[PDB]
């Protein structure tokens, strides 16, 4: 869902092609083989904060 400011106006024929390929590849993945290294890093960066602060652990 890309927010335009004369960007998809210039690439209107090329922009419409990889807009259909994004609602197709992400509808099935949805942070799976897009993340993997990102979901390991989120349960690591947030876990360092939570064990120190919150209430205690």
Swiss-Prot record:
This protein's name: Apolipoprotein C-I
Section covered of the full-length record: 27 to 83 of 83
């Amino acid at each position: 869902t890309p927010d335009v400011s004369s960007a998809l106006d210039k690439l209107k024929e090329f922009g419409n092609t990889l807009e259909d390929k994004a609602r197709e590849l992400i509808s099935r993945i949805k942070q799976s083989e897009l993340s993997a290294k990102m979901r390991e890093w989120f349960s690591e960066t947030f876990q360092k904060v939570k064990e120190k602060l919150k209430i205690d652990s």
